[PDB]
């Protein structure tokens, strides 16, 4: 099987560097080097993310889409930056304006064809394609607009292969941009109707989870990114490993989406202990479920405790008892019968790889489909209206060839999306 | 004379590797000896690969190891219809290529895991295509039906109400071994909170050895496969008896091993030792096939059983005077060199049809409704070549399996 | 045939009047009327009646949302080569003009906001799609009103038109002007023009009026076809000659399922007769307690129409 990552925008890009920083080491691939793999198993399934050309050069099969040179020229001028074949860099030296409209209708719409071109060169690579990984932020141009287009096109070209989306939904407390809800509401819209698996991460849900669950005092972006990339590795790549009970994107999809919206999840990693001290090793297993299922530790902003779950997928990856795994999951399902929805006898989807995260003994990625994420699109949707009402920075959109009915559309859509999700919380 | 076997679904394959292990182990045929007599099916390569990478690697022909690199999918539909379809032909081919090579066979011991994708669906049509290609044989399917409270898949029932209705009109005798109710045995009758799947497998891997292996093996009271279905099913419904083993004592802890027949037989009817959470809560037995093995005096049996026939609290069906098929083998059991199984010199693998499953089916049917009642993961099957028909019409199916297992008993 | 109901929120005038909101829509397809009533002794009690519709819209629902559920699904029908009709039905001031024509408490305003415009928008987008492009279709629009058995061309300065029927019984409105549109902007212009021209009494202090039947149509034509490829007729009905048309309308729609004439039904007749034809009826309801009698009348009418389903 296979997949082809997609680094839309700067963020989605910045993260690319971290997702590939990791993944590679979790596959023994040095900058341009080959497979130094401490083992022999980190190779029989690599294909999922690379391509064979030289014999020591397995190149990441991702796409780097962005209308701001400097960015990709920071990712390509640093560490692992020199492993991507230049063909991968689909830049847009234009003005990468922070407008969803500027990267979806006017500026991005041009650079698109020169992207799809490659997304096809990579898809028609070899063997059988599974789906595409998509990273980006719903709070900018090259991210929400242009990346949200990249998919609307992808999903027309292969409505068969899957589409996981890793979105950095606009954090609450403080917005790292101003129109944010504009660029956001507009991209979520496109998401709820193309990709079929979305993993929403919040820069501040991370800080928290990174400053209190990792006594880490100076959580640089690199970190946040790093933590995130840690989860997306547990998801995909991982399951493309052996296991007593292994799954793969689809299983994950076909066990997690009760209703076609596409629904968005909230990823959570397992061993998340501070370096030295904490290295408690309390990782027998009840310790991992202890972790994963708590409020804090959910990369999302919202707290599960604020709304039932529809599905859950503990994708563990480290030798354990299909008994102490299958078992724990249960008590968990009974101690919290309250929030776990009922019309699904077994919400949880236990998954079990074998080999764990390179240096760790036992981990377990969590992919939750809780109704709690209602209380986020609400947020976003609110911010919109409060500012849409006055058409705040709307001239930067319309003036870019947009529509007063376009914004209406998205909000509503994504706004209805909130509605539905409640239809199950009840 | 023989009995092919088709281990379907990762599980049916894990259990397969196990039952297949115990075999050579008690036949003096190490890693590389003769040639098996079965096949392995799965739509997830990595698992059958375990039989291609791990132990008992070269004891098989890459020909009796079928795989569909594609996708497993914990959903009946996909495994039965859509995907599972593509492989079936090929699958059959082996059970027609392996079925030919032999000499007057008796049937195919099928190994599947009720609530899976490749295990429920696929087989459904495998057994399906068999009942037509060899209606003139035995179709005893050895299942591992849904843990009463400790299920795994979220959908499980969808997959098990569907493997039951499609296989029902195709099997001869369906043996059942409850995954959870076996754990109890590992907790209560062997002591270990560390039971790896690799153990439950060693267990069924035992009870099964008592079925085929030893039985198809000479003895003082041989019992053919046909024998079963005949002495075991009162009615065409591919009736599902339950597997039970007697000396399930721990090879470390306690040691009273020397537990003469009179004991090991009584240890079969106590509900805490039957590889099935169908505690004889009321279910009247209607036929039991007491397969003994090891040093056993026919009188010992034709007495130990007599004592039972008159315990009454063990109430047998009405329309059934005597329902006790005494199967005596010679060679005692054969425990793994160093697993956790005691290792006695006599055992009782008694299986039977009990009005008890009236429960187990009930409790599993109800499950289904709850979800269907909301369509839950329905879109996952529909989009896989199924319809509101197959579900609703397979529900009605089992409905008359709740009435069937009710009528054939509870009444006189 | 699809039938929906949409409750409008209480207006400022009603609120100031302190009118009580009698209607609730607890579910997507459930509408409840909390009818106030008094016994002979004048005991007060509530008779809550329940109505079910394919879609029931609350006061919160926008025109876009309403449009999505009603008219939008019909557009494809015309491209399919069928004939679709969408009717706004209800009491005076219920919101029919607002929904079809555009947002205005006066029923007259922003064309873009209404179903005629939204439907047009979708027509251009679909025409552009690959399955359709081969069709080489041209889009035409017309707008006319029916008043006291008379047809007037809103596009051609209220010009009175004559309607004839052949022995074949097919009807034609001669003189009706069809205007070529190649952009939503175009359609908006025509809607504005027609709406200004729409019939009424003296300048009322507020609001428009529905003395007439308003019908805006979108036609697709290659070179005829079935007398044109497909046609969508959006009708803004007069507040519930009017009675006869409404009675006539009901029978025609119900006839649609299986397969006392009026002008409206006569002009629309081709839209009911064909096998490939779909209709949607939207019943508008004013939530005020004072309007309770009117609403039940509207709802019951609606029930019979859906009954055909």
Q: Where are the beta strands (DSSP E) in B183-307?
A: 242-244, 285-294
Sign of CA dihedral B12, B13, B14, B16: positive
Kindly report the CATH number that applies to the domain delimited by B357-412. Answer: 1.10.287.600
As a whole number of angstroms, the distance between CA C7 and CA C298 comes to: 12
- SS3 at position A168: coil
Helix residue ranges per DSSP H, C165-262: 184-197, 242-258
Torsion angle defined by CA atoms of residues A82, A87, A93 and A94, in that order, rounded to the nearest 10 degrees: -140
Phi, psi of A255 (to 5 degrees): -125, -10
Compute how many other C-beta atoms are within 10 angstroms of the C-beta atom of residue A157: 12
Structure tokens at B50: 């375990």
Q: What is the DSSP string of C38-59?
A: E-TT--EEEEEEEEE-SEEE-T
Domain boundaries C1-309, corresponding CATH code:
3.40.850.10
Class of residue B310 by CB neighbours under 10 A (exposed 0-12, middle 13-18, buried 19+) = exposed
Mutation test of the interface with chain B: which of A127, A255, A323, choosing the one with the most B Cβ atoms within 10 A? A323
The answer to whether the CB of B7 falls within 8 A of the CB of B37 is no
CB B88 within 8 A of CB B54: no
Q: Residue A175: which of A148, A147, A227, A137 has the closest Cα?
A: A137
Degrees, nearest 5: CA angle A321-A324-A330: 140
Which single residue is written with the structure tokens 């036949």? B27
Residues 6+ apart with CB under 8 A from A95: A67, A102, A107
CA distances to B26, B237, C87, C135, C136 from C230, rounded to whole Å, are 79, 57, 17, 12, 13
Copy the structure tokens of residue A210: 């990174």
Strand partners, C169: none
Nearest partner of A350 among C62, B150, B271, C151, judged by Cα = B150
Q: What are φ and ψ of residue C126, in 5° steps?
A: -70, -35
Catalytic residue, candidates B227, B263, B331, B402:
B227
User: CB–CB of A246 and B44 under 8 A?
Assistant: yes
Query: Comparing C-alpha atoms, which of B327, B299, B375, B362 is closest to residue B231?
Result: B327
Contact of C112 with chain A, judged by CB distance below 8 Å, is answered with: yes
> Closest by alpha carbon to C110, among C176, C60, C152, C63?
C63
Helix A374-388 × helix A404-425 angle, to 10°:
150
The two structure tokens encoding residue B80: 């039965």
Closest CA to B17 of B171, B200, B146: B200
Residue A387, CA distances (Å) to A394, A402, A410, B161 in order: 9, 17, 14, 53
Touching C (3+ Cβ pairs <8 A), the chains are A
Q: Are B43 and B73 a contacting pair, CB within 8 Å?
A: yes
Report how far residue A276's alpha carbon sits from residue B43's, in angstroms, rounded to the nearest whole number. 44
Contact A199, A402 (CB under 8 A): no
- C-alpha to C-alpha distance for A366 and C220, rounded to whole angstroms: 53
Contact call for residues C232 and C217 (beta carbons, < 8 A)? yes
**Domains located in chain A, CATH noted:** 1-258 (3.40.50.1440), 259-372 (3.30.1330.20), 373-426 (1.10.287.600)
What is the CATH number assigned to the segment(s) B1-241?
3.40.50.1440
Q: Residue A331: enclosing H or E segment and its boundaries?
A: helix A322-335
* DSSP letter for each residue of C85-135: EEEEEESTTSSHHHHHH-B-TTS-SBSTTSHHHHHHHHHHHHHTSHHHHTT
The two structure tokens encoding residue C229: 């490829």
Look at A346 and B194 and tell me if their CB atoms are within 8 Å: no
Residue (of B72, B221, B54, B233) closest to B140 by Cα position: B233
Is residue A398 marked as binding? no
Alpha carbon of A217: minimum distance to chain C alpha carbons (Å): 47
Phi, psi angle pair for B167, to nearest 5°: -90, -30
Question: Quick check: helix, strand or coil at residue A198?
Answer: strand
**Gap between the Cα atoms of A129 and A20, Å rounded:** 19
Cβ count within 10 A of residue A75: 24
Query: Cβ(A350)–Cβ(A239) under 8 Å?
Result: no
Contact A345 B157 (CB under 8 A): yes
Contact assignment for A408 to C121 by CB distance below 8 Å? no
Identify the three-state secondary structure at position B272: coil
Total residue count of chain A as it appears in this document: 426
Q: Which residues pair with C35 in a beta bridge?
A: C47
C201 is in an annotated binding site: no
Phi/psi at B168 (nearest 5 deg)? Answer: -45, -45
In 3D space, the residue among C175, C216, B150 whose CA is nearest the CA of residue A324 turns out to be B150
Q: In what order do the strands lie in the sheet with C30-38?
A: C23-27, C30-38, C44-52
A58 min Cα distance to partner chain B (Å): 23
d(CA B7, CA B5): 6
Q: Do chains A and C touch (3 or more CB pairs under 8 A)?
A: yes
Q: Which residues contact B311 (CB under 8 A, 6 or more apart)?
A: none
> Which of B154, B183, B190 to mutate to probe the A interface, most A CBs <10 Å?
B154
Q: Show Cβ contacts of residue B54 under 8 Å, excluding neighbours closer than 6 positions.
A: B17
**C-alpha of B253 from chain center:** 29
Task: Give backbone dihedrals phi and psi of B387, rounded to 5 degrees, phi first.
Answer: -155, 175
Contact between residue B261 and residue B298 where contact means Cβ atoms under 8 Å apart: no
B227 is catalytic: yes
For residue B202 the two structure tokens come to 């060693």
Q: Is B154 in contact with A347 (Cβ distance < 8 A)?
A: yes
The answer to whether the annotation marks C230 as part of a ligand binding site is: no
Helix (H) or strand (E) segment spanning residue A311: strand A309-317
Task: Give the number of other Cβ atoms within 10 Å of residue A10's Cβ.
Answer: 24
Distance CA C80, CA C221 (A): 12
Q: Which run of H or E residues covers position B7?
A: strand B3-8
User: How many whole angstroms separate alpha carbon C169 and alpha carbon C273?
Assistant: 11
Residue C268 near residue C217 (C-beta atoms within 8 A): no
CA distance A112 to C224: 39
| Helical pair B45-53 and B9-25, crossing angle rounded to 10 deg | 20
A416/C62 Cβ within 8 A: no
What is the rounded CA–CA span in Å between residue B147 and residue B182?
10
Q: Say how far apart CA A230 and CA A271 lie, in whole Å.
A: 11
The whole-angstrom separation of Cα B75 and Cα B381 is 7
Instruction: Report the b/e string of C40-77 with b at 16+ CB within 10 A.
Output: eeeeeeeeeeebebbbbbbbebebbbbbbbbbbebbeb
Q: What does the alpha-carbon distance between residue A369 and residue B17 come to, in Å, rounded to a whole number?
A: 36
Three-class SS state of C183: coil
Which residues does residue B259 pair with via DSSP β-bridges, in sequence order? none
The strand order across the sheet containing B140-143 reads: B65-67, B38-42, B3-8, B107-112, B140-143, B173-176, B242-244, B346-354, B285-294, B324-328
Boundaries of every domain in chain B: 1-241, 242-356, 357-412
Strand B140-143, strand C277-285: pairing: unpaired
Fold that domain B242-356 belongs to in CATH: 60s Ribosomal Protein L30; Chain: A; (3.30.1330)
In angstroms, rounded to a whole number, what is the distance separating the alpha carbons of residues B203 and B142? 13
State how far the Cα of B308 lies from the Cα of B19, in Å rounded to an integer. Answer: 30
Nearest to A368 by CA among A422, A315, A317: A315
Enumerate the residues of chain A whose CB falls inside 8 A of the CB of residue B195. 321, 323
Residue C303 dihedral angles phi and psi, to the nearest 5°: -60, -45
């Amino acid at each position: 099987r296979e997949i082809v990552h997609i680094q839309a925008g700067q963020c989605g890009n910045q993260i690319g560097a971290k997702f590939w920083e990791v993944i590679s080491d979790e596959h023994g691939i040095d900058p341009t080097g080959s497979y130094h793999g401490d083992s022999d198993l980190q190779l029989e399934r690599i294909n999922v993310y690379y391509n064979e050309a030289a014999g020591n050069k397995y190149v990441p099969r991702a796409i780097l889409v962005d209308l701001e040179p400097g960015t990709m020229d920071s990712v390509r001028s640093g560490p692992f930056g020199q492993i991507f074949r230049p063909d991968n860099f689909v830049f847009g030296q234009s003005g990468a304006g922070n407008n969803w409209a500027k990267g979806h209708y006017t500026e991005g719409a041009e650079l698109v064809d020169s992207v799809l071109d490659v997304v096809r060169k990579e898809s028609e690579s070899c063997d059988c394609l599974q789906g595409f990984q998509l990273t980006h932020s719903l709070g900018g141009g090259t991210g929400s607009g242009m990346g949200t287009l990249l998919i609307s096109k992808i999903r027309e070209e292969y409505p068969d292969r899957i589409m996981n989306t890793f979105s950095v939904v606009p954090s609450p407390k403080v917005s790292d941009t101003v129109v944010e809800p504009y660029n956001a509401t507009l991209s979520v819209h496109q998401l709820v109707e193309n990709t079929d698996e979305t993993y929403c991460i919040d820069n501040e849900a991370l800080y928290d989870i990174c400053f209190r669950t990792l006594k880490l005092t100076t959580p640089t972006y690199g970190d946040l990114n790093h933590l995130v990339s840690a989860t997306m590795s547990g998801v995909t790549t991982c399951l493309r490993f052996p296991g007593q009970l292994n799954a793969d994107l689809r299983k994950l999809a076909v066990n997690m989406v009760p209703f076609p919206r596409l629904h968005f999840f909230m990823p959570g990693f397992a061993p998340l202990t501070s370096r030295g001290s904490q290295q408690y090793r309390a990782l027998t297993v009840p310790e991992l479920t202890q972790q994963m299922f708590d409020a804090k530790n959910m990369m999302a902003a919202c707290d599960p405790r604020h709304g039932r779950y529809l599905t859950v997928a503990a994708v563990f990856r480290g030798r354990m008892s299909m008994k102490e795994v299958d078992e724990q999951m249960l008590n968990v399902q009974n101690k919290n019968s309250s929030y776990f929805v009922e019309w699904i006898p077994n919400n949880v989807k236990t998954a079990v790889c074998d080999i764990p995260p390179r240096g760790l003994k036992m981990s377990a990625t969590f992919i939750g489909n809780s109704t709690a994420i209602q209380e986020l699109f609400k947020r976003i949707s609110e911010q919109f209206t409060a500012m849409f009402r006055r058409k705040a920075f709307l001239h930067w959109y319309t003036g870019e060839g947009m529509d007063e009915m376009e914004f209406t559309e998205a909000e509503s859509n994504m706004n209805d999306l909130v509605s539905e999700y409640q239809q199950y919380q009840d | 004379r023989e009995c092919i076997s088709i281990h379907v679904g990762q599980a049916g394959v894990q259990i397969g590797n196990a039952c297949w292990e115990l075999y050579c182990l008690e036949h003096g045929i190490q890693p590389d000896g003769h040639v098996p007599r079965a096949v392995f099916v799965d739509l997830e390569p990595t698992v059958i690969d375990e039989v291609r990478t791990g132990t008992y690697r070269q004891l098989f022909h890459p020909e009796q190891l079928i795989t569909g690199k594609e996708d497993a999918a914990n959903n009946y539909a996909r495994g039965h219809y859509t995907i599972g379809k593509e492989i079936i032909d090929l699958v059959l081919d082996r059970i027609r290529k392996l079925a030919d090579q032999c000499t007057g066979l008796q049937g195919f011991s099928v190994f599947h895991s009720f609530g899976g994708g490749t295990g429920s669906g696929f087989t459904s049509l495998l057994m399906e295509r068999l009942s037509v290609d060899y209606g003139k044989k035995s179709k005893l399917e050895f299942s591992i039906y849904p843990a009463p409270q400790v299920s795994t898949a979220v959908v499980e029932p969808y997959n098990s109400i569907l493997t039951t209705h499609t296989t029902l009109e195709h099997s001869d005798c369906a043996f059942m071994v409850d995954n959870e109710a076996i754990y109890d045995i590992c907790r209560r009758n062997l002591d270990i909170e560390r039971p790896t799947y690799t153990n439950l497998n060693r267990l069924i891997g035992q009870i099964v050895s008592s079925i085929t292996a030893s039985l198809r093996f000479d003895g003082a009271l041989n019992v053919d496969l046909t024998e079963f279905q005949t002495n075991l099913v009162p009615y065409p419904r591919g009736h599902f008896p339950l597997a039970t083993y007697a000396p399930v004592i721990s090879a470390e802890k306690a040691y009273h091993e020397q537990l003469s027949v009179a004991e090991i037989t009584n240890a079969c009817f106590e509900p805490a030792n039957q590889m099935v959470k169908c505690d004889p809560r009321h279910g009247k037995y209607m036929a039991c096939c007491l397969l003994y093995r090891g040093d056993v005096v026919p009188k010992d049996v034709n007495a130990a059983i007599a004592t039972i026939k008159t315990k009454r609290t063990i109430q047998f069906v009405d329309w059934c005077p005597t329902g006790f098929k005494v199967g005596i083998n010679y060679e005692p059991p054969t425990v793994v060199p160093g697993g956790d199984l005691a290792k006695v010199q006599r055992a009782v693998c008694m299986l039977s049809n009990t009005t008890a499953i009236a429960e187990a089916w009930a409790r599993l049917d109800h499950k289904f409704d709850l979800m269907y009642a909301k369509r839950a993961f329905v879109h996952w099957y529909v989009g896989e070549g199924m319809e509101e028909g197959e579900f609703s019409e397979a529900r009605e199916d089992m409905a008359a399996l709740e009435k069937d297992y009710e009528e054939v008993g509870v009444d006189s | 045939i699809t039938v929906c109901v949409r409750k409008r929120p209480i207006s400022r005038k009603e609120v100031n009047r302190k009118e009580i909101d009698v209607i609730s829509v607890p579910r997507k397809d459930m509408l409840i009327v909390h009818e106030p009533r008094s016994k002979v002794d004048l005991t007060k009690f509530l008779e809550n009646h329940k109505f079910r519709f394919d879609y029931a819209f609350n006061d919160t629902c926008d025109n876009a949302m309403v449009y999505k559920y009603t008219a939008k699904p019909l557009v494809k029908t015309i491209f399919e080569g069928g004939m679709a009709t969408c009717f706004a039905y209800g009491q005076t001031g219920s919101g029919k003009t607002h929904t079809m024509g555009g947002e205005f408490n006066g029923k007259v305003q922003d064309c873009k906001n209404g179903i005629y415009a939204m439907a047009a928008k979708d027509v251009f987008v679909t025409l552009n799609m690959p399955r359709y492009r081969a069709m080489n279709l041209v889009v035409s629009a017309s707008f006319f009103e029916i008043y006291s058995g008379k047809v007037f061309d809103l596009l051609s300065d209220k010009q009175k038109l004559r309607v004839l029927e052949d022995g074949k019984q097919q009807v034609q409105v001669v003189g009706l002007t069809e205007k070529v549109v190649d952009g939503v902007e175009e359609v908006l212009k025509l809607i504005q023009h027609g709406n200004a021209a729409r019939t009424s009494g003296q300048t009322s202090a507020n609001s428009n009026s529905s003395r007439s039947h308003a019908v805006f149509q979108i036609v697709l034509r290659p070179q005829g076809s079935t007398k044109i490829h497909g046609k969508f007729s959006f009708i803004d009905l007069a507040g519930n000659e009017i009675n006869k048309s409404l009675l006539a309308l009901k029978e025609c729609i119900r006839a649609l399922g299986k397969q006392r004439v009026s002008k409206l039904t006569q002009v629309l007749r081709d839209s009911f007769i064909g096998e490939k034809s779909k209709t949607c009826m939207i019943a508008m309801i004013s939530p005020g307690l004072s309007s309770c009698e009117h609403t039940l009348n509207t709802l019951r009418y609606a029930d019979r129409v859906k009954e055909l389903v």
